[PDB]
Amino acid sequence: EPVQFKDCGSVDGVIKEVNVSPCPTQPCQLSKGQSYSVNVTFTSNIQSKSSKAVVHGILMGVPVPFPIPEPDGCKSGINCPIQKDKTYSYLNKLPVKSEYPSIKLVVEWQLQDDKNQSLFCWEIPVQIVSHL
Amino acid sequence: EPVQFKDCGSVDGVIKEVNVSPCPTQPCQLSKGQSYSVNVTFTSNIQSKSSKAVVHGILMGVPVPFPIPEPDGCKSGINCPIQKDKTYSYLNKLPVKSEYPSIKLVVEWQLQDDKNQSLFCWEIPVQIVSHLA
Amino acid sequence: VDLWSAPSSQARLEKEYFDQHFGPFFRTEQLIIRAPLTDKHIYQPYPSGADVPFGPPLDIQILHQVLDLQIAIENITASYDNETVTLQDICLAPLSPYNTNCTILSVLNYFQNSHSVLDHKKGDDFFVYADYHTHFLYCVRAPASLNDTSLLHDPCLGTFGGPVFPWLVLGGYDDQNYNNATALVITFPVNNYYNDTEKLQRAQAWEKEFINFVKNYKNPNLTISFTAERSIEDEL
Amino acid sequence: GPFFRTEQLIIRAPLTDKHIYQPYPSGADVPFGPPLDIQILHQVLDLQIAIENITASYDNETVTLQDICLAPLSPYNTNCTILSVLNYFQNSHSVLDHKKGDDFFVYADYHTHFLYCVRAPASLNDTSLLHDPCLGTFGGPVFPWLVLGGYDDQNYNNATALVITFPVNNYYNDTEKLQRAQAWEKEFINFVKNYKNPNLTISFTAER
Numbered sequence: 001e002p003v004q005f006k007d008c009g010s011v012d013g014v015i016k017e018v019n020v021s022p023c024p025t026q027p028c029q030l031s032k033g034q035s036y037s038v039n040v041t042f043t044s045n046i047q048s049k050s051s052k053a054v055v056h057g058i059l060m061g062v063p064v065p066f067p068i069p070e071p072d073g074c075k076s077g078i079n080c081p082i083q084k085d086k087t088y089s090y091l092n093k094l095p096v097k098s099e100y101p102s103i104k105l106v107v108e109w110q111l112q113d114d115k116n117q118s119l120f121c122w123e124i125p126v127q128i129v130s131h132l
Numbered sequence: 133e134p135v136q137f138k139d140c141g142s143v144d145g146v147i148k149e150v151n152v153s154p155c156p157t158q159p160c161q162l163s164k165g166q167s168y169s170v171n172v173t174f175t176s177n178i179q180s181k182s183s184k185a186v187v188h189g190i191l192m193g194v195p196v197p198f199p200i201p202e203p204d205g206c207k208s209g210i211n212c213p214i215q216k217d218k219t220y221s222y223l224n225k226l227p228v229k230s231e232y233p234s235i236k237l238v239v240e241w242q243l244q245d246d247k248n249q250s251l252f253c254w255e256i257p258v259q260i261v262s263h264l265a
Numbered sequence: 266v267d268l269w270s271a272p273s274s275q276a277r278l279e280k281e282y283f284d285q286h287f288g289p290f291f292r293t294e295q296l297i298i299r300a301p302l303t304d305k306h307i308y309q310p311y312p313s314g315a316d317v318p319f320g321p322p323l324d325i326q327i328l329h330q331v332l333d334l335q336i337a338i339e340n341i342t343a344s345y346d347n348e349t350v351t352l353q354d355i356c357l358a359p360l361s362p363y364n365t366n367c368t369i370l371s372v373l374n375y376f377q378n379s380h381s382v383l384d385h386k387k388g389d390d391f392f393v394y395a396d397y398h399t400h401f402l403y404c405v406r407a408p409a410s411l412n413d414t415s416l417l418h419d420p421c422l423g424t425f426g427g428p429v430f431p432w433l434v435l436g437g438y439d440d441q442n443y444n445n446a447t448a449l450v451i452t453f454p455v456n457n458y459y460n461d462t463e464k465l466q467r468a469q470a471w472e473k474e475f476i477n478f479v480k481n482y483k484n485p486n487l488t489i490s491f492t493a494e495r496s497i498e499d500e501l
Numbered sequence: 502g503p504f505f506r507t508e509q510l511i512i513r514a515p516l517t518d519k520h521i522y523q524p525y526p527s528g529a530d531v532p533f534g535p536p537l538d539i540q541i542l543h544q545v546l547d548l549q550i551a552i553e554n555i556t557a558s559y560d561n562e563t564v565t566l567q568d569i570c571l572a573p574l575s576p577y578n579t580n581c582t583i584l585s586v587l588n589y590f591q592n593s594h595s596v597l598d599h600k601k602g603d604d605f606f607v608y609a610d611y612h613t614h615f616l617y618c619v620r621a622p623a624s625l626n627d628t629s630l631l632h633d634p635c636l637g638t639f640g641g642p643v644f645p646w647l648v649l650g651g652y653d654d655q656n657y658n659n660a661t662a663l664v665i666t667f668p669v670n671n672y673y674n675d676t677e678k679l680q681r682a683q684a685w686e687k688e689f690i691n692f693v694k695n696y697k698n699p700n701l702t703i704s705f706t707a708e709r
C-alpha cells in the first residue's frame with residue numbers, strides 16, 4: 001500500500017510513491033522474523049551512470065547506518081544508466097530479524113547518484129513489534 | 133482596593149499591599165478626567181535618609197518616564213528617616229486627564245532610597261478608557 | 266530551484282486537488298447551534314483600536330463545547346452487516362490516503378478542530394496581544410491562507426486541506442460582519458456512492474446513529490438543530 | 502471534617518474503551534482506563550468549566566461559584582478549589598493537549614504528565630519535555646486517590662471513574678451565606694440534571 005512519507009531532500013529527483021508491503025496501517029508495523037518489501041517510484045531530473053542506496057535508522061534524532069545486502073540500485077530494478085525525465089521503481093525486500101529490538105524509529109532511505117546527490121530521500125514511521 | 137501586582141525587584145523592602153482606588157475590577161479601568169489614589173504598604177529592610185518616587189508607563193515592553201508632581205517620597209506619607217524593619221505607607225493621588233490616550237499599558241512604580249535601590253518596585257495593569265467595560 | 270518553497274507549493278497542490286474534487290453532490294449531515302445562555306461580548310485590541318463585537322455562539326466556552334460535540338460526532342460508530350461503520354468509512358475525504366481527515370465545514374476548522382489552537386494566546390504578563398479573536402477576524406477575510414499575519418502564525422485551512430468559507434458556517438450576522446454571527450452551521454459531507462448500494466447502506470446505517478446520538482445530546486448552554494440525508498427517504 | 506459543603510460528580514465513559522500508552526522509543530506498555538481518554542477529558546473539562554459558570558440569584562444579587570467556594574489564597578489567588586484530575590493540567594485545554602516529539606512519534610504528552618503527577622502532585626514542574634506543573638489552580642496539590650476510582654492497587658492509570666469535587670464554605674453562624682450557597686446549589690442541580698451526553702454517565706450530589 002502507498003504509505004505517507006516525508007521527503008528529506010530529493011534534489012536530483014521527484015518521488016512519485018513509496019509502497020511498503022504488507023503495511024495495512026501506518027506507522028508501519030514490522031513483525032519480527034518476517035520480510036517486507038519496499039517499492040519506490042520516482043522521476044529522475046538528471047542523467048547518472050550509477051546509483052547507490054543508503055539506509056539509516058533514526059533514533060532520538062540521530063541516524064544509525066543500516067547496511068543492506070545490495071546497495072547498488074542498478075541491481076534493484078533500475079535500468080542503468082539513469083536518464084533524465086525517466087521514471088523508475090527501486091525495489092527491495094528486507095527481513096525483520098529476531099535480534100532487532102521492539103522499538104519505534106524513523107527509517108530514512110536515500111538513493112545517491114554520480115555526484116553523490118539524492119535521486120530520492122524519504123522517511124516513514126516504523127515500529128518493530130513482537131509476535132508473542 | 134488591594135490589586136494584584138508584579139514585583140519588579142524590591143531589594144531594600146518587602147511590599148505588603150498595593151491599594152488603588154477606585155478600582156472595582158482589574159486591570160484597573162481609568163476614566164478620563166478623573167482621579168485615582170495609590171497607597172503602597174511595605175516593610176523596609178534598610179535604613180535610608182531619602183526616598184524618590186519614579187513612575188514609568190510600560191507600552192509594548194518599553195518603559196516611558198512619567199513625571200509626577202511630588203517625586204519626594206518623604207512628603208508622601210513616609211516619615212523620613214526610614215527605619216529598618218518598620219512598616220510604611222506611600223500615598224499619592226493622580227488625575228486621569230482627557231488628553232491622555234485611551235490605551236492599555238503597564239504602570240511601573242518604584243521608590244528609591246539612598247543607594248538608588250528600590251524599597252518597593254511593583255507594576256499593575258491599567259486601561260485608560262474612553263468608555264468602560 | 267528554491268528548496269524552501271516545497272511546503273508552500275505542496276500545500277497549494279493539495280488545495281487545488283481538493284477544490285478540483287469537491288463536487289456538487291454529497292449527503293449532508295448538518296447541525297445549527299445557538300447559545301441561549303450566553304450574551305454577546307466585545308473584543309478590544311492591544312494596545313488600542315476599534316472595539317469588535319462578537320456574537321453569543323463565538324464565546325470561547327461555547328466554541329469549546331461545540332468542538333466537543335463535533336469530535337464526538339466524528340467518533341460516532343454504527344453497526345451494519347456484522348461490521349462497524351465509522352464516519353471515516355463514508356466521509357468525503359478527497360486527499361486520502363495522504364490526508365485521511367474527514368471534511369468538516371465548521372468555524373472550528375479555522376482552528377483545525379483543536380482545543381489547543383482555539384486557546385492559543387500571546388501577550389505580556391497582563392494583556393493578550395493575539396488570541397482566537399484576531400485569528401477568526403483574519404481567517405474570514407483570507408480563508409485559504411496558510412498562516413495568519415499575527416503573533417500566532419496559525420493556519421486558516423481546515424484539516425481536510427481546503428479553505429472554509431465564512432458564509433457557509435455562520436448565520437444571523439449583518440452584512441459581511443461575520444463576528445456578529447448568532448448561529449453556527451456544522452456540515453458533514455458524506456459520499457453519495459451511486460453505483461455501490463452497499464457503502465450507501467453503510468452510510469445510512471451511520472446516519473441513523475447520528476440522528477439517535479444527537480437526539481440524546483442535551484446541553485443547557487446549547488440549542489442544537491440537526492438534519493440528516495436520511496430524513497428525506499424516510500418519509501416521501 | 503465538616504464546615505465544608507461538597508458538590509460532587511462521578512463521571513464514567515460507557516462508550517469508550519481502554520487504551521495502551523507505548524513509550525518512545527520502547528518500554529513497558531501502560532494501560533489507561535476509559536475515562537482517561539483525551540476526548541473524554543476535554544468533554545469533562547468543559548462540563549467542569551460550565552459548572553464554574555453557573556449563576557444563581559439571591560437577595561436581588563447574582564451568585565457565582567466564586568462567591569461561595571473555598572478559595573484559601575484569597576484575595577490574591579481567587580481561584581476556587583476544585584478537586585479533579587483536570588487540575589493536574591490546571592483545567593487548561595492547552596496544557597491537556599500539550600505534547601512533544603519529532604514529526605512522527607510523540608515523546609511526551611498528557612500520559613507521561615499524568616504518570617508523573619500522580620506520584621508527586623505538589624510538583625511545580627514535571628521532569629519531562631513538557632515542563633508543566635502538577636499543582637492545582639487553587640495553589641494546592643490534588644491527590645490521586647481523591648479524584649480517581651475503580652483502579653487497582655495504586656495504578657491510578659487504570660481508573661474507570663473520575664471524581665470532581667467543588668467544596669464550598671459551610672457556615673453555622675451565618676444563615677445568609679448558607680441560603681446563598683443553597684440557591685447556587687439549586688441552580689447547579691438543575692444544570693447537571695439537564696445535561697445529557699451519551700459518552701458520559703454522570704452521578705451528582707449536592708448538599709441537600
Ligand SMILES: CC(C)CCC[C@@H](C)[C@H]1CC[C@H]2[C@@H]3CC=C4C[C@@H](OS(=O)(=O)O)CC[C@]4(C)[C@H]3CC[C@]12C
Nearest residue numbers: 020036037038056057064066094095096100101107
Ligand atoms: C520499507 C521497510 C519495511 C524497510 C524495513 C527495514 C527495517 C527492517 C530495517 C531498516 C533500518 C533498520 C534499523 C536501523 C537501526 C537500528 C538500530 C540498532 O541498534 S543497535 O543497538 O544494534 O546499535 C538495532 C537495529 C535497528 C533498529 C534496525 C532494525 C531493522 C531496520 C528497521
Ligand SMILES: CC(C)CCC[C@@H](C)[C@H]1CC[C@H]2[C@@H]3CC=C4C[C@@H](OS(=O)(=O)O)CC[C@]4(C)[C@H]3CC[C@]12C
Nearest residue numbers: 152168169170188189196198226227228232233239
Ligand atoms: C493610581 C495609579 C495606579 C494610576 C494613576 C496613574 C496613571 C493615571 C498614570 C501613571 C503612568 C501614566 C502614563 C505614563 C506614560 C504614558 C505614555 C505617554 O506617551 S507619550 O508618547 O505621549 O509620551 C502618554 C501618557 C501615559 C500613557 C501616561 C498616562 C497616565 C498614567 C497611566
Ligand SMILES: *[C@@H]1O[C@H](CO)[C@@H](O)[C@H](O)[C@H]1NC(C)=O
Nearest residue numbers: 017019039040041089090091
Ligand atoms: C512498483 O510500483 C510501480 C508503481 O506503482 C509499479 O508500476 C511496479 O509494477 C511496482 N513493482 C513491483 C515489482 O510490483
Ligand SMILES: *[C@@H]1O[C@H](CO)[C@@H](O)[C@H](O)[C@H]1NC(C)=O
Nearest residue numbers: 054110112115116117118121
Ligand atoms: C555522500 O553524501 C551523503 C549525504 O547525502 C554523505 O552522508 C556521505 O558521507 C557522502 N559520501 C561520500 C563518499 O562522499
Ligand SMILES: *[C@@H]1O[C@H](CO)[C@@H](O)[C@H](O)[C@H]1NC(C)=O
Nearest residue numbers: 149151171172173221222223
Ligand atoms: C493605606 O493602606 C494601609 C494598608 O492597611 C492602611 O493601613 C492605611 O490606613 C492606608 N492609608 C490611607 C491614607 O488610606
Ligand SMILES: *[C@@H]1O[C@H](CO)[C@@H](O)[C@H](O)[C@H]1NC(C)=O
Nearest residue numbers: 184186242244247248249250
Ligand atoms: C537609579 O536606578 C534606576 C534603576 O534601579 C536607574 O534606572 C536610574 O538611572 C538610576 N539613577 C538615578 C535614578 O539617578
